[PDB]
Amino acid sequence: DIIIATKNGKVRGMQLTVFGGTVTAFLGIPYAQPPLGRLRFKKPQSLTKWSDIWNATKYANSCCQNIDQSFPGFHGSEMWNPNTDLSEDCLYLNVWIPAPKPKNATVLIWIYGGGFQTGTSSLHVYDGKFLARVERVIVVSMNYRVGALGFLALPGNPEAPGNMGLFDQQLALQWVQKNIAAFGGNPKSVTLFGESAGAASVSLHLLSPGSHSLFTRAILQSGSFNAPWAVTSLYEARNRTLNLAKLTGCSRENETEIIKCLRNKDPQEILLNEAFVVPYGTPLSVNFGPTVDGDFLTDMPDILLELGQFKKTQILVGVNKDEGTAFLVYGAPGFSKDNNSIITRKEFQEGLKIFFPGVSEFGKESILFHYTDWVDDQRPENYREALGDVVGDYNFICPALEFTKKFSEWGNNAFFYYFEHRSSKLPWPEWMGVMHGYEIEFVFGLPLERRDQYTKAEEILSRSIVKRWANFAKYGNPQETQNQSTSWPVFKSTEQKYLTLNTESTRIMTKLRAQQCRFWTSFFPKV
Amino acid sequence: DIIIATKNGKVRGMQLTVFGGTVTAFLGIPYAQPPLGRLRFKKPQSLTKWSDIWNATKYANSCCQNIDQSFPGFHGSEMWNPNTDLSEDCLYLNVWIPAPKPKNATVLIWIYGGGFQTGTSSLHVYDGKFLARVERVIVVSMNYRVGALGFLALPGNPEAPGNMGLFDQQLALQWVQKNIAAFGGNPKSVTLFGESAGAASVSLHLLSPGSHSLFTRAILQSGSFNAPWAVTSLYEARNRTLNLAKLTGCSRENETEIIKCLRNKDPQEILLNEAFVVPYGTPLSVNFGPTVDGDFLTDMPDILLELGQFKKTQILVGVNKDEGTAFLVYGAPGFSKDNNSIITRKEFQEGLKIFFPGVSEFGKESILFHYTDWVDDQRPENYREALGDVVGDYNFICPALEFTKKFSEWGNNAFFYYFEHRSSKLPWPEWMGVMHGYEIEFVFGLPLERRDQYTKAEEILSRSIVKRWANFAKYGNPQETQNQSTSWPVFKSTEQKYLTLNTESTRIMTKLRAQQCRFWTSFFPKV
Amino acid sequence: DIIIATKNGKVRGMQLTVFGGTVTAFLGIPYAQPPLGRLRFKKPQSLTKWSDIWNATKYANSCCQNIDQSFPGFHGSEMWNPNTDLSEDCLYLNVWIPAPKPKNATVLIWIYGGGFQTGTSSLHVYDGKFLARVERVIVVSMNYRVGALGFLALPGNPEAPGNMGLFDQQLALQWVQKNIAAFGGNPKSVTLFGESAGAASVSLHLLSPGSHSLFTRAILQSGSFNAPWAVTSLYEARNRTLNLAKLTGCSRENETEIIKCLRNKDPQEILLNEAFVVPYGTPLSVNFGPTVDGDFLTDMPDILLELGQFKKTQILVGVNKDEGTAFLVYGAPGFSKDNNSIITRKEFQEGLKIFFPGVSEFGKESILFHYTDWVDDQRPENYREALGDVVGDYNFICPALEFTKKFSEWGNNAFFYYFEHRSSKLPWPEWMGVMHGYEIEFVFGLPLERRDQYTKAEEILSRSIVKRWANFAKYGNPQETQNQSTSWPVFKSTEQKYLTLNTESTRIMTKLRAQQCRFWTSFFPKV
Ligand SMILES: *[C@@H]1O[C@H](CO[C@H]2O[C@@H](C)[C@@H](O)[C@@H](O)[C@@H]2O)[C@@H](O[C@@H]2O[C@H](CO)[C@@H](O)[C@H](O)[C@H]2NC(C)=O)[C@H](O)[C@H]1NC(C)=O
Ligand SMILES: *[C@@H]1O[C@H](CO[C@H]2O[C@@H](C)[C@@H](O)[C@@H](O)[C@@H]2O)[C@@H](O[C@@H]2O[C@H](CO)[C@@H](O)[C@H](O)[C@H]2NC(C)=O)[C@H](O)[C@H]1NC(C)=O
Ligand SMILES: *[C@@H]1O[C@H](CO[C@H]2O[C@@H](C)[C@@H](O)[C@@H](O)[C@@H]2O)[C@@H](O[C@@H]2O[C@H](CO)[C@@H](O)[C@H](O)[C@H]2NC(C)=O)[C@H](O)[C@H]1NC(C)=O
Ligand SMILES: *[C@H]1O[C@H](CO[C@H]2O[C@@H](C)[C@@H](O)[C@@H](O)[C@@H]2O)[C@@H](O[C@@H]2O[C@H](CO)[C@@H](O)[C@H](O)[C@H]2NC(C)=O)[C@H](O)[C@H]1NC(C)=O
Ligand SMILES: *[C@H]1O[C@H](CO[C@H]2O[C@@H](C)[C@@H](O)[C@@H](O)[C@@H]2O)[C@@H](O[C@@H]2O[C@H](CO)[C@@H](O)[C@H](O)[C@H]2NC(C)=O)[C@H](O)[C@H]1NC(C)=O
Ligand SMILES: *[C@H]1O[C@H](CO[C@H]2O[C@@H](C)[C@@H](O)[C@@H](O)[C@@H]2O)[C@@H](O[C@@H]2O[C@H](CO)[C@@H](O)[C@H](O)[C@H]2NC(C)=O)[C@H](O)[C@H]1NC(C)=O
Ligand SMILES: *[C@@H]1O[C@H](CO)[C@@H](O)[C@H](O)[C@H]1NC(C)=O
Ligand SMILES: *[C@@H]1O[C@H](CO)[C@@H](O)[C@H](O)[C@H]1NC(C)=O
Ligand SMILES: *[C@@H]1O[C@H](CO)[C@@H](O)[C@H](O)[C@H]1NC(C)=O
Ligand SMILES: *[C@@H]1O[C@H](CO)[C@@H](O)[C@H](O)[C@H]1NC(C)=O
Ligand SMILES: *[C@@H]1O[C@H](CO)[C@@H](O)[C@H](O)[C@H]1NC(C)=O
Ligand SMILES: *[C@@H]1O[C@H](CO)[C@@H](O)[C@H](O)[C@H]1NC(C)=O
Ligand SMILES: *[C@@H]1O[C@H](CO)[C@@H](O)[C@H](O)[C@H]1NC(C)=O
Ligand SMILES: *[C@@H]1O[C@H](CO)[C@@H](O)[C@H](O)[C@H]1NC(C)=O
Ligand SMILES: *[C@@H]1O[C@H](CO)[C@@H](O)[C@H](O)[C@H]1NC(C)=O
Ligand SMILES: *[C@@H]1O[C@H](CO)[C@@H](O)[C@H](O)[C@H]1NC(C)=O
Ligand SMILES: *[C@@H]1O[C@H](CO)[C@@H](O)[C@H](O)[C@H]1NC(C)=O
Ligand SMILES: *[C@@H]1O[C@H](CO)[C@@H](O)[C@H](O)[C@H]1NC(C)=O
Ligand SMILES: *[P@@](C)(=O)OCCCC
Ligand SMILES: *[P@@](C)(=O)OCCCC
Ligand SMILES: *[P@@](C)(=O)OCCCC
Ligand SMILES: [Cl-]
Ligand SMILES: [Cl-]
Ligand SMILES: [Cl-]
Ligand SMILES: [Cl-]
Ligand SMILES: [Cl-]
Ligand SMILES: [Cl-]
Ligand SMILES: [Cl-]
Ligand SMILES: [Cl-]
Ligand SMILES: [Cl-]
Ligand code: NA
Ligand code: NA
Ligand code: NA
Ligand code: NA
Ligand code: NA
Ligand code: NA
Ligand code: NA
Ligand code: NA
Ligand code: NA
C-alpha cells in the first residue's frame, strides 16, 4: 500500500512488476475541475480540494474526439485510437515513480500528438513504467482537450479565448511544480518531451511566458510550431468558428450568444461538424489548433523565434527517415497499404493536388520540378518515393531543421538526430519505410521487454536511446558514456552536425536535406 | 462602458472605432497637482487622491506658451500649434489601449518637441489610436511645462531649481510604473520615444539617475542632448532669469523675492517677455531649456556621455534628409515658402550671420569654405541647398550621429535610420525637401488610414516603420521579419551602418555625412 | 545657520566664502570615544551619543607626536608641522560640503602622511574647501593615532593588538557610511586618497576585509604598502615594544602588566623614547607602523598582492620626479638646503651607509655599481643626483610601479602618473627638484586661489588635475574631456603606459625607470 498526501489531498497507486523490480503507478489523478456545462471552451480552472483518498489505479477518460475509421481491425492504425471512454471529463494525469521512492528524481513530462484533434496519454506506446524502472526517472503524462472543444477561438472574448488545450497542459505542468516533490520528484529538473502535435506543443511552451518557469529543458520528436499545420491564423480561426455555428444552427448576433448556444449542443454534434468547417482539407488538416491569443501566445511564433524571444535552455530535436509515407494512404490516388503503390506521373500530380489544394498551378509545378530530376535510372518506385519525401520534407523535417538553426543562433546547446530504423514488428508494408510515429516505442523502451520479440539489436538500440534521453533530461547532454558510444556533437549553424540512430552504424553527418530545405524554406513560402 | 481603478481613483474612457476594430482612449488623466500660485516654477508635486469617477473623455489644457504667427492660415505651420485651451493647469496624460484589453502589453511613451518652448500631446499627428489598434501596444503621452514656466532656473534655490518640465515628464513615467498594469500594461516593457526637443528629452532620461528604472529602452527622432540648442549653461541661465525680472519690473535683492515677485505676474506678461531675455536670437533659440541642476542632471552631459555614465540599453536613432530647411523661412533673407528661394552668395553670407550671430568672422568664413566647394556645375540652387545643409548638419544630423557613436562604444546595440521620403501631402514647397518633423505621421501610422489619401506606397512604408518601431519596443530589435525585408544592422563605430527608409529602395549605407561631421564635430567647436 | 542631525546627534558648521560662492565646513566632529587612560593602545571604541548641538567650527586636537626641529623657522619644514594642540584626545574628522547642499555627491576621503609617526588633517595644504567649491564633491578627512600610541604591537594580546591608527581610519570610513547622506553625500560613491604613509594606508584598506565595503575606489600618491618602510615585521615589532618598556622602566613579566605600566606613563615620556627603540635609524625610519595582526591585516601583504586577495576596483597611482631629495638633508653628509650640495664619491659611499645601515658591504657596492656608470660627462652634480635617485627609486617609485603591475594583472583598470612640475613657490633650493609632497597643493587646488600668486600655468595645471581626480572619483576614469586634453590610457603589464603632469607638454610614456626597477625589484631583495 502506497499513499501520497498532495496539495489537493491523498491519492493511492498500485505496485507494478517491471523487469525484476517494482514501479509505483498513479493513474488518473485529476488536475483541474471537469470542464463541463458552463466551463466548456473556457480555460481550465483549478481543483476544489478533497477529503478521502483518491484511487489513481486505472487510466481515466480520454477527451472527446473523432476516431480514424479508414482501417477498421488493422493494428497499425488502431494502436493510435483511444483505449479508454471518451468523455468531456478528461483532465487527468499519470505519474510513474521508481521503487523504492527516489529522493530528487528528474521528471519527464510527455505530451502526446494527434494533430491537435486526437490522442490520449493512456496508449500502450506511452507507458512510462519502463523509463521509471530502468533510468530511475519519474514520468508524468496528462490528457488535454483536443479539436473544437480544445481550440475553438473567438478572439479576445474569454467564453472561447483559444488555446484551452495548451492551458490544460500548462496547468498540468504547474501541478507538477506544486506536488511532485511529495512523489520524490525534483520540480527544478523537469524535461518536456512529446511527438508531432505534442512536439509542437513543447515548442510553444518554450515561447510562452506562463510556461517559462514550469520546466527546465525540452525534447521535440517530429514536430515544431513553425511546421505549416501547427498554428491557425486569426482570420481562418474566425471563419472556422462561425462556420461551425452555421452548421449546428447556432448562427447568432451577439458573439457570447454563439458560445452560449454551442455550449448547449451535445458533444457528438460538434464532433460531427468539425470536419466541414473547411472547404477542402488534406490528410494534414488541423481544423482547430493553436492561435495567437495574446495570452498563451503573445505574437506570431515566427517573429518570436526569429528575434530570440523564448526560454534559453538546451533542446533535443529529431525526425524519422520517412515521416511523409503514413499520410499518402489517407487520400493520395493509387496508394494502398495492401500493395506497393507504384504510381504514375499523372497520379503524382493529382497527389500534389490533394496535399496542396489552395496552392497555385505554378506553385505545384515548382514542387514537381524540384522533386523529379533523378538521378536517374528508370526506377518504377520513383514517383511513389518522391510524394513521400515531398510530404515529409515540407511538413516535418525542414521545419524541424529550421527551428533548430534558429534556436541555436541565440547561444544555446541543441542536438539533432535522424532516426532511420524500421521496426521488425511494423504492421505497415515495407515501402512505407521508417514511418512517422514509430520511434516512440524505442524512446519508452518497449523493446527492453524480453517477452515481446523485438530483435536483440532493437533491444540494444532502445537501451541506448533511453540512456541518451535520460542523460539529456538530467544533465543537458545526450551522451551514452559507458559503452564507448559515438559522441553526439552540438548542432551549430554553419556546421549543422546531426546524429543517426540505427541498429547498425551510428554516424555523425552534416546538413540534412540541404537542397530540399532551401526549396521549402526559401522559395516555397513566397508562392 | 469602461472604468479602471487607478492608485488615485477611478477613470472612465471612451470607445473608438479604428480600422474595423476598437480602441479604448483615456484622454486627460491628471498626473500631478496643478502647478499654480505658489507651485509655479516648482517641481511637480504628487496627486491628492479622489472620490468619484474621473472622466478622461477629452484632451486637456495645453501648457502656456507662445504661438507661431509667421504663417496665419497655413496648414504647414498651424498643424503644430496647440489645439486645446492654454492654461497653467496642464499636467495631464493620455492612454490608448487595445480592445479587448490586453494582458501585458508593451508600452510606448511619447514626448513631443517644440524647442522646449512649445508643443502639446493633443496634436492630430500624435494620436496613438492607430499604434494601439495595429500593433496591440499601449500608447502613453503627457503634457509637460515649456518656456520660462518649465525651465526658469535660479541655481540650487528650489523656488526655481530648473528642469521642471523634465520632472513633469519623469513624474508621468512614474505614473506609468504605478498604474499601467491596471490598463493591461507591462511596466517592465516601456519604450520612450520622442522627436526634436522630445528626442533630446529622451536622451536626458537616459542620463538621469531618477529615470533609470522608469523605462526599458529609447527611440530618438531628429534630436539629442548634445545638439547645440539643447542645454543652457548656468552662466546663460542666470543672465536670462535676471533679464526676465528686469523686464517685468521684478528686479529685487533677495533671490527668493525675485521668484515671489515673478509668481505674482500673469502668465501673459511672462510669455510676452521671454523673447527678449537674449540680445539676439536665431530661429533656433531656446531661451529657457534644460540646465545642469545637480538633481535631474548631475554634471554636464558631454562628460557623462564621454565617460559612459548612462543607462545601458538599446537605442534607435535617426534623422531626416532635409532637417535644416524649415528654419530658413523664419529669418533667412531671400527665403520664402511661396517661391523657390534661389539665393546669392551675398544672401548666404547674411544667412550665416542670422544663424551664427555670436560667432567670429573666421568661424563664419570656415562654414562658407566647407560648404561651397562644388562639385560643380553652375547650378542656381547651389547656395539655397548649402544653407539648408549647414543648418541641418550642425543642429541635427551630426549631433545625432555623434551621440550614436558615443553611446555604442559602451557596448550596447544601436540602430540608425535616414528617412528620405517626402510626403505626397506636404503643404510646404518642393525645394524644402524631406523636412524636419514629417516622419512623425509615418511613425503614428496616419497613412494606414484608408480614407485620407496618402499613396499606396506611403501606406506600405508606414506599415513597415510601425512594425519596426513596435518590434524595437517589444524585443530590442527593429526588424520586419515577415515580408522579407532588408535586415537592419547594428550601428558600430568603425563600420557605422545605417538604414534608409524610403518608399522605393530600402538600403544599407555607411558613414552618413562623413566629411561634414568631421567639420562640425572636430573643427567648429574650437572656434 | 546650518545644522545636520547625525546618528550621534546634531552638529553646526560655518559658512565659508570661496571663489565667489559658498562652502559649508564642519570642523572637528568626533568619531570615536577619546582613547585615554584604559583605552590607550586599544582599538577605537564607538561614540556614546549626545544631547545638545555639537559645534564643529574649529579644527580639533592633532594626535600626540614628535615635531621636526631640524629647520626651526623655515617654511619648507614647518608647513608640515602640526597646526593645532597635540593631545591624546584627537579622534575627530572634518567635512566640507557644497552650498547649496548637494543631493548625492561623490565623497573624497583624505588620509595624510607623516611616516606613521607624524601628520594631521588640519594642515593648510589639506584644506578641502576648494575641491568642494569647484567640483561639487564632498571632502572628508580624519585624525588617526600615530607613533607608538597608534602602532604599538604586542601580538594577539588586545591591550595592544597593533594597527590602532589604521582602525581609527577604518572607523572614520564607517562614520562616513552611516552619516554622510545627511550631509548630501552618496555613501556608495567614496574614493579614498592619501599621500606617503597616507597612500600606503589606502593600499592596506584595499587589502583589509573590514574595509572592503566602506569605499568604492582609491588614489595612491607616492606611497604603497610594499614600500620598504611600510610594514613592520612581528619580530621587529616585539623587539621594539620590549625595548620601549625597558627605556621607560616598564620591563615586567606578564605582558598585560607591561601594557598596564605603559598606560601609566605620560605621553611625553613615551614620545621621548620612541626614537631609540632601534639601534640605528635612517631618515626613513618607521619605528612604529603597520603590522600583520591577524585582524586588519590577515597575512603578509606581499602574499595577498601576489595571489590577488584584495578589493577589485580602479586605482590611480603616481609619483613625483624627485621623491628622494627631501631626505638627504636629514642626515647625508655634505648635503645642505643652504648650498648646492656637490658631493664626492666618498660622501656618496658614506651616504649609502646612512640610508642602508644593516646592509652588507656587497649590497652597498651593488647600488654604487648600478647608479654610477654615467653617461658620462664629468658633471660635478653626478653623485648628488645619484643619491637622490637611489633613495627615491628604492623607497617610492619602484614600489609604486610594482604595486601597479601587480594590481592590474588581476583585471582592473589602473592609471599611472609622473608629476614633474616644480612649484614656482617652492622654498627648498632648486637642486632638490620636484620634491616629495609638493603635488598635494595642486591636488587640493591651492593655485586656483587668485590672490596667492602661483603662475597662470600652475593655475591651469591645477585646474586640470582637480578635474582628473574628480572625474576619477565620480566615474572611474581620470580624463579631462572638455579642453581637448591628452587622454590618459590604462596601465597594463607589458605596455605600462603612464601620463606626465607638467605645466608645458602633457605626454604618454612607457616603462618608467625600467632599468632601475629591475635592480630594486629583482636583484636587491636577495641581498
Ligand atoms: C494498389 O491499390 C490501389 C487502391 O485501390 C485498390 O485497393 C487494392 C488493394 C485493390 O484491392 C482494389 O480493389 C482497390 O480499388 C489501386 O488504385 C486503384 O485502381 C483501381 C482499379 O484500376 C481504380 O478503380 C481506382 O481509381 C484506384 N483506387 C483508388 C482508391 O485510388 C492501385 O492500382 C493498386 N496498385 C498496384 C497493384 O500497383
Ligand atoms: C522670394 O521671396 C522673397 C521674400 O520676400 C517676398 O515674398 C514674396 C513671396 C513676394 O511676394 C514679395 O512681395 C516679398 O517681399 C524675396 O526677397 C525679397 O526681395 C524683395 C524685393 O526685391 C526685397 O524687398 C526684400 O529685401 C526681400 N524680402 C525679404 C523678406 O527678405 C525674393 O526675392 C523672392 N525670390 C525669388 C522670386 O526667387
Ligand atoms: C654645504 O654645506 C655642508 C653642510 O654643513 C655646513 O652648512 C653650511 C651651510 C655652512 O654654513 C657650514 O658652516 C656647515 O658646516 C658642508 O659640509 C660640511 O663641510 C664642513 C666644513 O668643511 C665640515 O666641517 C662638515 O663635516 C660638513 N658638514 C656636515 C654637516 O656634514 C658642505 O661642504 C657645503 N658644500 C658646498 C659649499 O658645496
Ligand atoms: C470560409 O467561409 C466560407 C464558408 O462557407 C462554408 O460554410 C461552412 C458552414 C461549410 O459548410 C463549408 O463547406 C463552406 O465552405 C467559405 O466559402 C466556400 O467558398 C466557395 C467558393 O470557393 C463557395 O462555393 C462556398 O461559399 C463555400 N464552399 C462550398 C463548397 O460550398 C470560404 O471559402 C472560407 N474561407 C477560406 C477558406 O478562406
Ligand atoms: C546678458 O546680460 C545683458 C542684459 O542686457 C539685456 O537686458 C535685458 C532685460 C534685455 O532687454 C536685452 O535686450 C538686453 O540685452 C546683455 O547686455 C547687452 O549687451 C550689449 C552689448 O553688446 C549692450 O548694448 C546692452 O547692455 C545689451 N543689449 C542691448 C541690445 O541693449 C548681455 O549681452 C547678456 N550676456 C550674454 C548674452 O552673454
Ligand atoms: C633589538 O634588541 C636589542 C636591544 O638593545 C637596545 O636596548 C634598547 C632599549 C635601546 O636603548 C637600543 O639602543 C638598544 O639597541 C638590540 O641590541 C643592540 O645590539 C648591539 C650589537 O650590535 C649591542 O651593542 C646592544 O645590545 C644594542 N645596541 C647598543 C647601541 O647598545 C638588537 O640589536 C635589536 N635587534 C634588531 C635590530 O634586530
Ligand atoms: C480504493 O481501492 C481499495 C482496494 O483495496 C478500497 O479499499 C477503497 O475503498 C477504494 N476506493 C473507493 C472504492 O472509492
Ligand atoms: C533537489 O535538488 C535541488 C537542485 O537541483 C535542490 O535545490 C533541492 O533542495 C533538492 N531537494 C531535495 C534534496 O529534497
Ligand atoms: C451580448 O450579451 C452578453 C451576454 O449576455 C452581454 O453580457 C453583452 O454585454 C452583450 N453585448 C453586445 C455587444 O450586445
Ligand atoms: C552497456 O553494456 C552492456 C553490455 O556490455 C549492456 O548490456 C548495457 O545495456 C549497456 N548499457 C547501456 C546504457 O547501453
Ligand atoms: C462622465 O460622463 C457620463 C456620460 O455618460 C456622465 O454620466 C457622468 O456624470 C460624467 N461625469 C461628470 C459630468 O462629471
Ligand atoms: C508581465 O511580464 C513580465 C516580464 O516581462 C512578468 O515578470 C510579469 O509578472 C508579467 N505580468 C503579468 C503576466 O501580469
Ligand atoms: C530672503 O528672504 C527669504 C524668503 O522670505 C528668507 O527665507 C531668506 O532667509 C532671505 N535670505 C537672505 C540671504 O537675505
Ligand atoms: C506584409 O505583407 C502583406 C502583403 O503581402 C501586407 O499587406 C502587410 O501589411 C505586411 N505586414 C507588414 C508588417 O508590413
Ligand atoms: C556654538 O556657537 C554659537 C555661536 O552663535 C553659540 O550660540 C552656541 O552656544 C555654541 N555652542 C557652545 C558655546 O557650546
Ligand atoms: C544615490 O545614488 C545611488 C547610486 O549610486 C542610489 O542607489 C541612491 O539611492 C541615491 N540616493 C539618493 C538619490 O538620495
Ligand atoms: C597576567 O595578568 C593579567 C592581567 O591582570 C591576567 O588577567 C592574566 O591571566 C595573567 N597571565 C599570566 C600568563 O600570568
Ligand atoms: C577649460 O577651458 C577654459 C578656457 O577655455 C578654462 O578656463 C577652464 O578652467 C577649463 N576647465 C578645466 C576643467 O580645465
Ligand atoms: P501529428 C500525428 O500530431 O501531426 C501531423 C500533422 C497534421 C495532422
Ligand atoms: P525641435 C522642433 O523641438 O527643436 C528645434 C531646436 C530649436 C528650437
Ligand atoms: P611619508 C612622508 O609619510 O613617508 C616617508 C617614509 C619614511 C618616513
Ligand atoms: Cl534518407
Ligand atoms: Cl507534364
Ligand atoms: Cl558539410
Ligand atoms: Cl542626402
Ligand atoms: Cl567673398
Ligand atoms: Cl565605408
Ligand atoms: Cl626623470
Ligand atoms: Cl672605490
Ligand atoms: Cl616601450
Ligand atoms: Na501518429
Ligand atoms: Na546502438
Ligand atoms: Na539528405
Ligand atoms: Na516641428
Ligand atoms: Na517599404
Ligand atoms: Na552623405
Ligand atoms: Na611630507
Ligand atoms: Na595642463
Ligand atoms: Na626613466
From Swiss-Prot, chains A, B, C:
The gene is BCHE. One of its GO terms (molecular function) is choline binding. N-glycosylated. No other PTM detected. The major N-glycan structures are of the complex diantennary type with 1 and 2 N-acetylneuraminic acid molecules (Neu5Ac) making up approximately 33% and 47% of the total N-glycans, respectively. Only low amounts of fucosylated diantennary N-glycans are detected (approximately 2%). Triantennary N-glycans with or without fucose amount to approximately 13%, whereas 5% of the total N-glycans are of the oligomannosidic or hybrid type. It is linked to Butyrylcholinesterase deficiency: An autosomal recessive metabolic condition characterized by increased sensitivity to certain anesthetic drugs, including the muscle relaxants succinylcholine or mivacurium. BCHED results in slower hydrolysis of these drugs and, consequently, a prolonged neuromuscular block, leading to apnea. The duration of the prolonged apnea varies significantly depending on the extent of the enzyme deficiency. Homotetramer; disulfide-linked. Dimer of dimers. It comes from Homo sapiens (Human). This is Cholinesterase. Changing L123F: In BCHED; seems to cause reduced expression of the protein. It is found in: Secreted.
